[PDB]
Amino acid sequence: DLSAASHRIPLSDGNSIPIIGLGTYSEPKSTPKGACATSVKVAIDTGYRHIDGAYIYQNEHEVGEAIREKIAEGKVRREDIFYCGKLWATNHVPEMVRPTLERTLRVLQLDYVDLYIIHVPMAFKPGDEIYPRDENGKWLYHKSNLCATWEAMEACKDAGLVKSLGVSNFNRRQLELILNKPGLKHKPVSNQVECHPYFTQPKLLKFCQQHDIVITAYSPLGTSRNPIWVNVSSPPLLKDALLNSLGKRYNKTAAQIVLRFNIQRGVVVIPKSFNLERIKENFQIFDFSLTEEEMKDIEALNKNVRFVELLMWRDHPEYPFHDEY
Ligand SMILES: NC(=O)c1ccc[n+]([C@@H]2O[C@H](COP(=O)([O-])OP(=O)(O)OC[C@H]3O[C@@H](n4cnc5c(N)ncnc54)[C@H](OP(=O)(O)O)[C@@H]3O)[C@@H](O)[C@H]2O)c1
Ligand SMILES: C[C@]12CCC(=O)C[C@H]1CC[C@@H]1[C@@H]2CC[C@]2(C)[C@@H](O)CC[C@@H]12
Ligand SMILES: [Cl-]
């Protein structure tokens, strides 16, 4: 059972993961310096013990600053904090995996990360640009070799630089490539994908559960709805009539309802907020439960439409979203 003080759930490698974490992606341009550090500190003060981040979010040094400050003052021990980092598309070449993880460790100034995941199954041209596009606009797709990339990840765990290994934005067959790998040492313990009531991931969740893989729900609140990259065709998730009606019943916000929905069914949620009140609000989800009837009803909101389509990359051979799941 889950509580504010104790809400870690088992991973297949004997480790465990806090079922709620703080997401840390924020638009580099429109975000004040220090905002991420401040939020991570508030989150830890609030009770979060899981932070989701990525070097390419450009604020990993702020995440590290915050975690180390809280450890230094004795708010938490290192082992009490769960940090997930991500290997980006430009860094899939096996020889680059360990140096890329080591960079993140040096940025955080920590000895290990709790979880390290392949960010997308698509490889891009290695280089100083995380989004490689030629003069004419065309994205530069390096050939993907997921099993080889995974082998390089496994070696990182063998070296003790990371406790658990996972993936993100992987479809069922991409998960199969790895699960069926000849001589596999460490299976993925987690797949981080878009998940929330408008895109509930019914099949992928069942598939993962059968293979003892935990789903981490990114954009669990339906995203910030930034037009530049979000599919704003769907109505804003938080304005949903049913989610709002249930909020009233429990004296909770729509956001609190949607978070409770996913964690109640064993899905890890990583809502992002850099706002003091909302950081606290998102954590207050252990003092009520939804009925099965309500869960069913929230499930039924599924639109099978993604806020996060990444269409500009739909031409890459490993684009994950062509398949049904
Ligand atoms: N693996 C991947 O490919 C991938 C992709 C996307 C995201 N992620 C991860 O998942 C994290 C969360 O997903 P996300 O950032 O895209 O979107 P999200 O967590 O679903 O929602 C973020 C938006 O909701 C607002 N918000 C937060 N709490 C709220 C509340 N209680 N009421 C109303 N609004 C609220 C935030 O604004 P404020 O900050 O002002 O509160 C922000 O604009 C990301 O930060 C990142 O760590 C991973
Ligand atoms: C979706 C997403 C995917 C990759 C990531 O980690 C961040 C996220 C939000 C920012 C997006 C990016 C894909 C590429 C862009 C759409 C860039 O072209 C401008 C903003 C970028
Ligand atoms: Cl990276």
Side-chain angles (χ1 to χ4, degrees):
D1 219 285
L2 306 174
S3 72
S6 178
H7 51 263
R8 300 175 68 111
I9 66 178
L11 295 173
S12 63
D13 57 6
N15 293 306
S16 66
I17 181 167
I19 200 160
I20 179 166
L22 180 71
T24 60
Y25 175 73
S26 194
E27 204 183 41
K29 160 178 56 63
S30 75
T31 307
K33 305 301 193 201
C36 178
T38 296
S39 300
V40 172
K41 290 170 208 174
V42 165
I44 289 165
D45 284 344
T46 298
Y48 293 70
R49 295 295 183 265
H50 173 180
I51 309 296
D52 181 79
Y55 181 73
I56 61 153
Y57 295 171
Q58 303 182 46
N59 57 11
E60 212 172 33
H61 58 282
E62 291 194 33
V63 169
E65 173 196 314
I67 293 174
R68 291 180 286 108
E69 178 169 336
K70 291 298 161 178
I71 290 169
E73 65 177 25
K75 186 68 184 192
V76 280
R77 303 161 298 174
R78 175 68 186 89
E79 52 259 56
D80 294 320
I81 289 293
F82 185 107
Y83 178 74
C84 174
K86 311 195 191 70
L87 183 83
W88 183 238
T90 52
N91 296 69
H92 272 219
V93 179
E95 292 65 43
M96 293 180 75
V97 172
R98 179 160 178 173
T100 300
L101 175 57
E102 289 174 341
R103 179 180 61 196
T104 270
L105 293 177
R106 289 175 174 120
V107 172
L108 291 168
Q109 294 171 57
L110 297 170
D111 292 346
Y112 68 94
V113 291
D114 301 83
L115 180 61
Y116 198 53
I117 70 182
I118 306 182
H119 199 151
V120 292
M122 290 103 52
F124 297 174
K125 189 191 74 176
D128 293 1
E129 171 51 29
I130 80 176
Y131 310 124
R133 287 190 289 194
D134 60 5
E135 27 286 357
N136 318 317
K138 169 218 255 286
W139 294 87
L140 315 180
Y141 304 146
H142 188 276
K143 171 177 293 180
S144 294
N145 185 344
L146 301 182
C147 281
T149 299
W150 190 254
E151 242 184 300
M153 295 280 283
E154 288 181 317
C156 289
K157 175 169 181 169
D158 288 341
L161 302 171
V162 51
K163 285 183 71 175
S164 301
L165 298 175
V167 300
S168 179
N169 293 306
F170 274 44
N171 64 34
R172 179 198 187 282
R173 56 153 299 264
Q174 291 165 335
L175 284 179
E176 287 291 37
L177 240 27
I178 296 176
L179 280 172
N180 295 325
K181 186 184 182 299
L184 179 76
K185 283 286 175 305
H186 309 294
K187 56 203 292 195
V189 299
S190 189
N191 187 10
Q192 186 178 123
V193 287
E194 183 182 351
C195 191
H196 50 67
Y198 283 177
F199 197 97
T200 52
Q201 299 276 13
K203 276 170 188 163
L204 189 58
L205 181 51
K206 194 178 315 299
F207 176 81
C208 290
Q209 291 168 340
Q210 292 183 273
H211 297 278
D212 219 356
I213 298 173
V214 171
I215 289 268
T216 293
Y218 78 70
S219 307
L221 300 179
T223 86
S224 75
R225 296 182 66 87
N226 189 319
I228 295 181
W229 61 272
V230 182
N231 177 26
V232 292
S233 301
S234 282
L237 172 73
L238 295 187
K239 296 302 178 171
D240 192 77
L242 174 59
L243 293 176
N244 281 272
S245 126
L246 289 173
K248 294 302 189 320
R249 182 177 303 189
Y250 291 101
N251 201 20
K252 294 286 179 170
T253 59
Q256 291 172 305
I257 301 292
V258 319
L259 293 173
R260 177 70 204 180
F261 166 64
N262 258 327
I263 71 164
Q264 198 165 315
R265 58 176 193 154
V267 171
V268 181
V269 295
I270 48 171
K272 173 275 180 170
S273 179
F274 287 177
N275 175 267
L276 187 72
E277 289 75 40
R278 296 193 278 282
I279 290 162
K280 298 182 165 310
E281 166 184 329
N282 298 343
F283 190 72
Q284 313 307 317
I285 55 175
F286 297 108
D287 66 341
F288 73 103
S289 68
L290 297 166
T291 66
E292 303 200 18
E293 223 55 79
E294 294 161 328
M295 293 289 296
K296 209 289 181 296
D297 296 333
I298 302 176
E299 246 272 53
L301 293 172
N302 185 30
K303 302 192 177 197
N304 281 356
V305 180
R306 298 172 189 269
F307 292 108
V308 184
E309 305 186 306
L310 312 179
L311 298 169
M312 68 278 284
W313 296 329
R314 85 175 300 170
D315 267 358
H316 188 288
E318 294 292 352
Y319 179 76
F321 306 145
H322 293 315
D323 295 7
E324 183 187 48
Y325 74 107

Coordinates of all heavy atoms in Angstrom, one line a residue, residues 12 24 44 56 60 67 92 95 110 118 129 140 142-143 145 160 189 209 225 265 284 307 322:
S12 N 12.2 -5.1 -11.4 CA 12.5 -6.5 -11.6 C 13.9 -6.9 -11.2 O 14.2 -8.1 -11.2 CB 12.2 -6.9 -13.1 OG 13.0 -6.2 -14.0
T24 N 11.3 17.4 -14.9 CA 12.1 18.5 -14.9 C 12.4 19.1 -16.3 O 13.2 20.0 -16.4 CB 13.5 18.3 -14.2 OG1 14.2 17.3 -14.9 CG2 13.3 17.9 -12.7
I44 N 11.6 17.9 -2.7 CA 12.2 17.0 -1.7 C 11.6 17.4 -0.3 O 11.2 16.5 0.5 CB 13.7 17.0 -1.8 CG1 14.2 16.3 -3.0 CG2 14.3 16.4 -0.5 CD1 15.7 16.6 -3.4
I56 N 19.9 16.6 -21.8 CA 19.6 17.5 -22.9 C 18.5 18.5 -22.5 O 18.0 19.3 -23.2 CB 19.1 16.7 -24.1 CG1 17.9 15.9 -23.8 CG2 20.2 15.9 -24.7 CD1 17.0 15.6 -25.0
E60 N 20.5 19.8 -15.8 CA 20.9 18.6 -15.0 C 21.8 19.1 -13.9 O 21.9 18.5 -12.8 CB 21.5 17.5 -15.9 CG 21.2 16.1 -15.3 CD 21.6 15.0 -16.3 OE1 22.6 15.1 -17.0 OE2 21.0 13.9 -16.2
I67 N 19.8 18.2 -5.2 CA 19.9 16.9 -4.6 C 21.1 16.9 -3.6 O 20.9 16.4 -2.4 CB 20.1 15.7 -5.6 CG1 18.8 15.5 -6.4 CG2 20.6 14.4 -4.9 CD1 19.0 14.5 -7.6
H92 N 23.8 7.1 -29.3 CA 23.4 5.7 -29.3 C 24.6 4.8 -29.7 O 24.6 3.6 -29.4 CB 22.3 5.4 -30.3 CG 20.9 5.6 -29.7 ND1 19.9 4.8 -30.0 CD2 20.5 6.5 -28.8 CE1 18.8 5.1 -29.4 NE2 19.1 6.2 -28.7
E95 N 30.1 2.9 -28.3 CA 31.3 3.5 -27.7 C 31.0 4.8 -27.0 O 31.8 5.2 -26.1 CB 32.4 3.7 -28.8 CG 32.9 2.4 -29.3 CD 31.9 1.5 -30.1 OE1 31.1 2.1 -30.9 OE2 31.9 0.3 -29.9
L110 N 27.4 13.2 -8.9 CA 27.1 12.1 -8.1 C 27.8 10.8 -8.6 O 28.3 10.9 -9.7 CB 25.5 11.8 -8.2 CG 24.6 12.9 -7.6 CD1 23.2 12.6 -8.0 CD2 24.8 13.0 -6.1
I118 N 17.3 4.6 -22.4 CA 17.3 5.1 -23.7 C 16.1 6.0 -24.0 O 15.0 5.5 -23.9 CB 17.3 3.9 -24.7 CG1 18.4 2.9 -24.4 CG2 17.4 4.4 -26.2 CD1 18.5 1.7 -25.3
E129 N 25.1 18.8 -31.9 CA 23.8 19.2 -32.0 C 22.8 18.1 -31.6 O 22.9 17.0 -32.2 CB 23.5 19.7 -33.4 CG 22.0 19.9 -33.7 CD 21.3 20.8 -32.7 OE1 22.0 21.6 -32.0 OE2 20.1 20.6 -32.4
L140 N 18.8 14.3 -39.8 CA 19.9 13.3 -40.1 C 19.8 12.1 -39.3 O 20.3 12.0 -38.1 CB 21.3 14.0 -39.9 CG 21.3 15.4 -40.5 CD1 22.7 16.1 -40.3 CD2 20.9 15.4 -42.0
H142 N 20.9 8.6 -38.1 CA 21.9 7.6 -38.0 C 21.1 6.2 -37.9 O 20.0 6.2 -37.4 CB 22.8 7.8 -36.7 CG 23.9 6.8 -36.6 ND1 23.8 5.6 -36.1 CD2 25.2 7.0 -37.0 CE1 25.0 4.9 -36.1 NE2 25.8 5.8 -36.7
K143 N 21.8 5.2 -38.4 CA 21.2 3.8 -38.3 C 21.1 3.4 -36.8 O 22.1 3.5 -36.1 CB 22.0 2.8 -39.1 CG 21.6 1.4 -38.9 CD 22.4 0.4 -39.7 CE 22.0 0.6 -41.2 NZ 22.8 -0.3 -42.1
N145 N 20.9 0.6 -33.8 CA 21.2 -0.7 -33.4 C 21.0 -0.9 -31.9 O 21.9 -0.7 -31.1 CB 22.7 -1.1 -33.8 CG 23.0 -2.6 -33.5 OD1 22.3 -3.3 -32.8 ND2 24.1 -3.0 -34.1
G160 N 28.8 -0.4 -12.0 CA 28.2 0.2 -10.9 C 27.9 1.7 -11.0 O 27.7 2.4 -10.0
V189 N 13.8 -2.5 -16.9 CA 12.9 -2.6 -15.7 C 11.8 -1.6 -15.8 O 10.8 -1.7 -15.1 CB 13.7 -2.3 -14.4 CG1 14.8 -3.3 -14.2 CG2 14.2 -0.9 -14.4
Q209 N 3.5 -5.4 -18.1 CA 3.2 -6.1 -16.9 C 3.5 -7.6 -17.0 O 4.0 -8.3 -16.0 CB 1.8 -5.9 -16.4 CG 1.4 -4.5 -15.9 CD -0.1 -4.3 -15.8 OE1 -0.9 -5.0 -16.4 NE2 -0.4 -3.3 -15.0
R225 N 1.1 21.8 -23.2 CA 0.4 22.1 -24.4 C 1.1 23.2 -25.3 O 0.4 24.0 -25.9 CB -1.1 22.6 -24.1 CG -1.9 21.5 -23.5 CD -3.3 21.9 -23.3 NE -4.0 22.2 -24.5 CZ -4.7 21.3 -25.2 NH1 -4.7 20.0 -24.8 NH2 -5.3 21.7 -26.3
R265 N -3.1 2.2 -10.3 CA -3.0 1.0 -11.1 C -1.5 0.7 -11.3 O -1.2 -0.1 -12.3 CB -3.7 1.2 -12.4 CG -3.3 2.4 -13.2 CD -4.0 2.4 -14.5 NE -3.5 3.3 -15.5 CZ -3.6 3.1 -16.8 NH1 -4.2 2.1 -17.3 NH2 -3.0 4.0 -17.7
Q284 N -0.1 15.5 -3.1 CA -1.2 15.2 -2.2 C -2.2 14.1 -2.7 O -3.3 14.5 -3.0 CB -2.0 16.4 -1.7 CG -1.1 17.6 -1.3 CD 0.0 17.2 -0.3 OE1 -0.4 16.5 0.7 NE2 1.2 17.6 -0.4
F307 N -0.7 13.6 -27.2 CA -0.3 14.9 -27.1 C 1.2 15.0 -27.7 O 1.6 16.0 -28.2 CB -0.3 15.5 -25.6 CG -1.7 15.6 -25.1 CD1 -2.2 14.7 -24.1 CD2 -2.6 16.6 -25.5 CE1 -3.4 14.8 -23.6 CE2 -3.8 16.7 -25.0 CZ -4.3 15.8 -24.1
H322 N 4.2 4.4 -35.4 CA 3.5 3.8 -36.5 C 2.7 2.6 -36.1 O 1.5 2.6 -36.2 CB 4.5 3.4 -37.6 CG 5.2 4.5 -38.3 ND1 4.6 5.7 -38.7 CD2 6.5 4.6 -38.7 CE1 5.5 6.4 -39.3 NE2 6.7 5.8 -39.3

